[PDB]
Design a protein around this ligand. Sequence first.
Ligand SMILES: CN1c2c(O)nc(N)nc2NC[C@@H]1CNc1ccc(C(=O)N[C@@H](CCC(=O)O)C(=O)O)cc1
Length: 638
Amino acid sequence: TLRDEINAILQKRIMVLDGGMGTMIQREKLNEEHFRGQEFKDHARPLKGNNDILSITQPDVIYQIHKEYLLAGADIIETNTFSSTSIAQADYGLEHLAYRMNMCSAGVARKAAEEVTLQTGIKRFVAGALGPTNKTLSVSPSVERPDYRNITFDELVEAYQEQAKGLLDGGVDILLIETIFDTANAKAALFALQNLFEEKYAPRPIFISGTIVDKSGRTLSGQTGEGFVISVSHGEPLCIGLNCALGAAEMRPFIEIIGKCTTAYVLCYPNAGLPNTFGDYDETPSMMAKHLKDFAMDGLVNIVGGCCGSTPDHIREIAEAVKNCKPRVPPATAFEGHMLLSGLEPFRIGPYTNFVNIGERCNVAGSRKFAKLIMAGNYEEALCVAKVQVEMGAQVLDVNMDDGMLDGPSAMTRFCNLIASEPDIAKVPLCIDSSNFAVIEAGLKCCQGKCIVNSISLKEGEDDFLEKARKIKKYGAAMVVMAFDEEGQATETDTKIRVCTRAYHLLVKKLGFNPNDIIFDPNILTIGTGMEEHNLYAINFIHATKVIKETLPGARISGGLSNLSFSFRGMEAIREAMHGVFLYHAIKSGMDMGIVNAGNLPVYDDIHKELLQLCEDLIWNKDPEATEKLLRYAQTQG
Ligand SMILES: CN1c2c(O)nc(N)nc2NC[C@@H]1CNc1ccc(C(=O)N[C@@H](CCC(=O)O)C(=O)O)cc1
């Protein structure tokens, strides 16, 4: 296929990509009549500056620019479709034509590519460019309305799907999500591409390239390079990298950092230096070629090119410079065994990582303060609960909005949108927890990074679980699988192990799920309720954690720690004591993380020795009278 053909070329030599199409169009200096052409002569809105309309109004100019770039030495030419969505064309009144413009841009690029391929013998490729659009999902249009968004995930999915329909019907060889200002927009474009590839169309290679705005190393939406790579690698792009907004000397460290984090190829086409006082990126082609050759000799990049300021002279110099350079070899074992989560910053859970705290207090059903703030509509002050959780040591935040008084999806969308507006909250990943899958989808469609979906299970059959898991994989997030099946909630050790194994072998063998993205919850259940059947639950969880960790490769283990101490509510210190003891024994068992009260977990050594012994007796059922003894000990604290 096309992906194999491109991958074969990328292994032997470095590939050169198009260049500054807008810069070439600027030297043409077309006027309003030239932009309109004959067909749009009486169009009610101005079309000057709309470079995408030239594909139907001035095909000759676009074709000549493509031929110039290809004869310069470029191997891949982007289509003139940077603003060819219905949303981007809404400024020009050309919403209905987004399919037509994409089709004609693909055709006019393909004719030039075929002509140059015939004339030179070197096969050329056409990359369908999908622009970032002026609308942002992860950033509010106004400072005073942080939770407000003027565009939704579904609208952008529809627009990008129409654009990609136009591009694929025109016959592009590569799809290129470029100049990503918002990682959520890139995820929406990937979602649309997955819809198209799973409905009718054979897959095409996908090139993803972000944009580091400043020397701070973060995109426009605030995500770092590693976080961006983690977020957008669920679609498995053939190439990843950066473009524009920076010169090579300013882009080199970020390119190295990205190259060391992904097993995909690295594409880098930066601006031709900094703009001068006149506004022209004046870095000469020779200096650009030398900078890209320094990039290539170090093994930093695999695809080179130029963003704004790159004329075909720059492309000729770059192509002749990188002609003899040896390509980058991707690291095949990039963070093997780790679980790769992300918010604004990467969060990797490896085999030698400590216990990961997940903040339980952002739960409507299980936090009195959070529920009190949410039902009043005061999400602004309910964000302070997550702030305190992160300040207190929570590495992941668990979000739950399940209540009959609340509209689930709307509340979860608003809370995720408000979370994204706060930097220190947004750097840690989120845990999407809800019994309704609509709320889970609403949470996944508002997240910038890679989150965890909580509470998926075999409760409603194999087919429903499989469909939900397929949707989660398409969204590309991590997911927790409960030990819950058609017979009910798992309580015995053997039943927990059987349910977890059955869930695991479905996901990996049939759905092809990533084993490092699966988290198993053997259902920590309350003990010491006064009922003798409930006294073995902690032991069952610990043994199930043992067997699951030593029999299911790559699968993590988590659970709700506070569930174990429901019988002793109001007696907080004893609850923290059992939490410490159970955490000690479960981490010795293999519990990788858990939804826990982040700052209220004492270490096993500073627990009071008498209370330590009482909690050990209760949890391990060493004494049939343990629960009443612990209650009496609590009563002695009067
Ligand atoms: C049900 N349990 C759970 C689970 O067992 N397994 C998974 N995967 N996910 C989850 N998510 C929800 C839940 C864990 N979260 C919890 C569990 C318990 C509490 C809790 O004890 N809250 C206190 C009040 C909290 C307060 O106001 O301070 C209470 O009185 O009940 C608070 C949060």
